[PDB]
Amino acid sequence: VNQSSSVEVSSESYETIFSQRIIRDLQKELVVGALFEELPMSSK
Amino acid sequence: VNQSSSVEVSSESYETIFSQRIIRDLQKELVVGALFEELPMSSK
16 A cells, blocks of 8 residues: 555555546457348237 | 446445545543743753
């Protein structure tokens, strides 16, 4: 916790900027969900 | 944590509000140091 200071912080939690920015990885590409055309069935 | 259901924050630190209010306990009262008077010496 940066203890070389003579007046250190309580816990590391006050030494961070919890940033709520949500990032995600590149993510699989979806190819065949929609290549195909759709038959609007209206019955079973 | 609070994994109760579906979607979870990440960690406790992301389920908490980190205040910066600072508190001190009852401390101790200082009685002696100030009771007496000073002889403004200007020399050894």
